[PDB]
Structure formats: C-alpha cells, structure tokens
C-alpha cells in the first residue's frame, strides 16, 4: 500500500504544500492504481 503523506497545517509552507501536493497526487494515483 502506497505511503500516505502527512497533512500540513500550522507549517504549510509553499515547499511543504507543493511537496504535499506531489505526495497527495502520488498517493491518489497509486491508491487508485492499487
């Protein structure tokens, strides 16, 4: 099962948010593919 990325909040910097975006897109892609 694909890695679920940790959700950002208090420290959702553009970098962490973009990284989260990529990991969330990865997670969703691989989740559906799984």
């Amino acid at each position: 099962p694909p890695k679920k990325p940790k959700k950002p909040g208090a420290g959702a910097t553009p970098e962490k948010l973009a990284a989260y975006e990529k990991e969330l897109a990865a997670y969703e892609k691989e989740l559906a593919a799984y």
Side-chain angles (χ1 to χ4, degrees):
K3 168 184 175 301
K4 176 182 288 182
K6 282 172 172 56
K7 284 69 184 308
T13 61
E15 192 288 302
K16 170 73 181 184
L17 200 63
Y20 183 73
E21 195 292 305
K22 286 179 168 63
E23 289 195 79
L24 186 69
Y27 177 68
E28 291 187 290
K29 177 196 175 306
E30 292 306 300
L31 191 68
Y34 188 81

Coordinates of all heavy atoms in Angstrom, one line a residue, unseen atoms left out:
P1 N 0.8 -1.2 0.0 CA 0.0 0.0 0.0 C 0.9 1.3 0.0 O 1.8 1.4 0.8 CB -0.8 -0.1 1.3 CG -0.1 -1.1 2.1 CD 0.6 -2.0 1.2
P2 N 0.5 2.2 -0.9 CA 1.3 3.5 -1.0 C 1.3 4.3 0.2 O 0.4 4.4 1.0 CB 0.6 4.2 -2.2 CG -0.8 3.6 -2.3 CD -0.6 2.2 -1.8
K3 N 2.4 5.0 0.4 CA 2.6 5.9 1.6 C 1.7 7.1 1.6 O 1.6 7.8 0.6 CB 4.1 6.4 1.6 CG 4.4 7.6 2.5 CD 5.8 8.1 2.4 CE 6.1 9.3 3.3 NZ 5.1 10.4 3.0
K4 N 1.0 7.2 2.7 CA 0.1 8.4 2.9 C 0.9 9.5 3.5 O 1.6 9.4 4.5 CB -1.0 8.0 3.9 CG -1.9 9.2 4.3 CD -3.0 8.9 5.3 CE -4.1 8.0 4.7 NZ -5.1 7.7 5.7
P5 N 1.0 10.6 2.7 CA 1.7 11.8 3.2 C 1.1 12.5 4.4 O -0.1 12.6 4.5 CB 1.7 12.7 1.9 CG 0.6 12.3 1.1 CD 0.3 10.9 1.5
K6 N 1.9 13.0 5.3 CA 1.5 13.7 6.5 C 0.9 15.1 6.1 O 1.5 15.8 5.3 CB 2.6 13.9 7.5 CG 2.9 12.7 8.3 CD 4.2 12.9 9.1 CE 4.4 11.7 10.1 NZ 4.5 10.4 9.4
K7 N -0.3 15.3 6.5 CA -1.0 16.6 6.2 C -0.4 17.8 6.9 O -0.1 17.8 8.0 CB -2.5 16.4 6.6 CG -3.4 15.6 5.6 CD -3.0 14.1 5.8 CE -3.8 13.2 4.7 NZ -5.2 13.5 4.8
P8 N -0.2 18.9 6.1 CA 0.3 20.1 6.6 C -0.8 21.1 7.1 O -1.9 21.1 6.6 CB 1.0 20.7 5.4 CG 0.1 20.3 4.2 CD -0.5 19.0 4.6
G9 N -0.4 21.9 8.1 CA -1.4 22.8 8.6 C -0.7 24.1 9.1 O -0.5 25.0 8.4
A10 N -0.3 24.0 10.4 CA 0.4 25.1 11.1 C 1.7 25.5 10.3 O 2.0 26.7 10.1
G11 N 2.4 24.6 9.8 CA 3.6 24.8 9.0 C 3.5 24.4 7.5 O 4.4 23.8 7.0
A12 N 2.4 24.8 6.9 CA 2.2 24.5 5.5 C 2.8 25.5 4.6 O 2.1 26.4 4.0 CB 0.7 24.4 5.2
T13 N 4.1 25.5 4.6 CA 4.9 26.4 3.7 C 4.7 26.1 2.3 O 4.4 24.9 2.0 CB 6.4 26.4 4.1 OG1 6.9 25.1 3.9 CG2 6.6 26.8 5.6
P14 N 4.9 27.0 1.3 CA 4.8 26.7 -0.1 C 5.5 25.4 -0.5 O 5.0 24.6 -1.3 CB 5.4 27.9 -0.8 CG 5.2 29.0 0.1 CD 5.3 28.4 1.5
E15 N 6.7 25.2 0.0 CA 7.5 24.0 -0.3 C 6.8 22.7 0.3 O 6.6 21.8 -0.5 CB 9.0 24.1 0.2 CG 9.9 23.1 -0.3 CD 9.7 21.7 0.3 OE1 9.8 21.5 1.6 OE2 9.5 20.7 -0.5
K16 N 6.4 22.8 1.5 CA 5.8 21.6 2.2 C 4.4 21.4 1.5 O 4.0 20.2 1.4 CB 5.6 21.9 3.7 CG 4.7 20.9 4.4 CD 5.3 19.5 4.5 CE 4.4 18.5 5.2 NZ 5.1 17.2 5.5
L17 N 3.8 22.4 1.1 CA 2.5 22.4 0.4 C 2.6 21.8 -1.0 O 1.7 21.0 -1.4 CB 1.9 23.8 0.4 CG 0.3 23.8 0.2 CD1 -0.4 23.2 1.4 CD2 -0.1 25.3 0.1
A18 N 3.6 22.1 -1.7 CA 3.9 21.6 -3.0 C 4.3 20.2 -2.9 O 3.9 19.3 -3.7 CB 4.9 22.4 -3.7
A19 N 5.1 19.9 -1.9 CA 5.6 18.5 -1.7 C 4.4 17.7 -1.3 O 4.3 16.5 -1.7 CB 6.6 18.5 -0.6
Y20 N 3.5 18.2 -0.5 CA 2.3 17.5 -0.1 C 1.4 17.3 -1.3 O 0.8 16.3 -1.5 CB 1.5 18.4 0.9 CG 0.2 17.6 1.4 CD1 0.3 16.5 2.2 CD2 -1.0 18.1 1.0 CE1 -0.8 15.9 2.6 CE2 -2.2 17.4 1.3 CZ -2.1 16.3 2.2 OH -3.2 15.6 2.6
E21 N 1.4 18.3 -2.2 CA 0.6 18.2 -3.5 C 1.1 17.0 -4.3 O 0.3 16.2 -4.7 CB 0.7 19.5 -4.3 CG -0.3 19.7 -5.4 CD -0.1 18.7 -6.5 OE1 1.0 18.6 -7.1 OE2 -1.1 18.0 -6.9
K22 N 2.4 16.9 -4.5 CA 3.0 15.9 -5.2 C 2.8 14.5 -4.6 O 2.5 13.5 -5.2 CB 4.5 16.1 -5.4 CG 4.8 17.2 -6.5 CD 6.3 17.4 -6.6 CE 6.6 18.3 -7.8 NZ 6.0 19.6 -7.7
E23 N 2.9 14.5 -3.2 CA 2.8 13.2 -2.5 C 1.3 12.8 -2.4 O 1.0 11.7 -2.4 CB 3.3 13.3 -1.1 CG 4.8 13.4 -1.0 CD 5.3 13.1 0.4 OE1 5.4 11.9 0.8 OE2 5.7 14.1 1.1
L24 N 0.4 13.8 -2.4 CA -1.0 13.6 -2.4 C -1.5 13.1 -3.8 O -2.3 12.2 -3.9 CB -1.8 14.8 -2.0 CG -3.3 14.6 -1.8 CD1 -3.6 13.8 -0.5 CD2 -4.0 16.0 -1.7
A25 N -0.9 13.6 -4.8 CA -1.2 13.2 -6.2 C -0.6 11.8 -6.4 O -1.3 11.0 -7.1 CB -0.6 14.2 -7.1
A26 N 0.6 11.6 -5.9 CA 1.2 10.3 -5.9 C 0.3 9.3 -5.2 O 0.1 8.2 -5.7 CB 2.6 10.4 -5.3
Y27 N -0.1 9.7 -4.0 CA -0.9 8.8 -3.1 C -2.2 8.5 -3.8 O -2.6 7.3 -3.8 CB -1.1 9.5 -1.7 CG -2.0 8.6 -0.8 CD1 -1.6 7.4 -0.3 CD2 -3.3 9.1 -0.5 CE1 -2.4 6.7 0.5 CE2 -4.1 8.3 0.3 CZ -3.7 7.1 0.8 OH -4.5 6.4 1.6
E28 N -2.8 9.5 -4.4 CA -4.1 9.2 -5.1 C -3.9 8.4 -6.3 O -4.7 7.4 -6.6 CB -4.8 10.5 -5.4 CG -5.3 11.3 -4.2 CD -6.1 12.5 -4.7 OE1 -5.5 13.5 -5.2 OE2 -7.3 12.5 -4.4
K29 N -2.9 8.7 -7.1 CA -2.6 7.9 -8.3 C -2.3 6.4 -7.9 O -2.9 5.5 -8.5 CB -1.3 8.5 -9.0 CG -0.9 7.7 -10.2 CD 0.5 8.0 -10.7 CE 1.0 7.1 -11.8 NZ 0.9 5.7 -11.4
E30 N -1.4 6.2 -7.0 CA -1.0 4.9 -6.6 C -2.1 4.2 -5.8 O -2.2 2.9 -5.8 CB 0.3 4.9 -5.8 CG 1.5 5.3 -6.6 CD 1.7 4.5 -7.9 OE1 1.8 3.2 -7.8 OE2 1.7 5.1 -9.0
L31 N -3.0 4.9 -5.1 CA -4.1 4.4 -4.4 C -5.1 3.8 -5.4 O -5.6 2.6 -5.2 CB -4.8 5.4 -3.5 CG -5.8 4.9 -2.5 CD1 -5.1 4.1 -1.4 CD2 -6.5 6.1 -1.9
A32 N -5.4 4.6 -6.4 CA -6.3 4.1 -7.5 C -5.7 2.9 -8.2 O -6.4 2.0 -8.6 CB -6.7 5.2 -8.4
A33 N -4.4 3.1 -8.5 CA -3.7 2.0 -9.2 C -3.6 0.8 -8.4 O -3.5 -0.3 -8.9 CB -2.3 2.5 -9.6
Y34 N -3.6 0.9 -7.1 CA -3.6 -0.2 -6.2 C -4.9 -1.0 -6.2 O -5.0 -2.1 -6.7 CB -3.2 0.2 -4.7 CG -2.9 -1.0 -3.8 CD1 -1.7 -1.6 -3.8 CD2 -3.9 -1.4 -2.9 CE1 -1.5 -2.7 -2.9 CE2 -3.7 -2.4 -2.0 CZ -2.4 -3.1 -2.0 OH -2.2 -4.1 -1.1

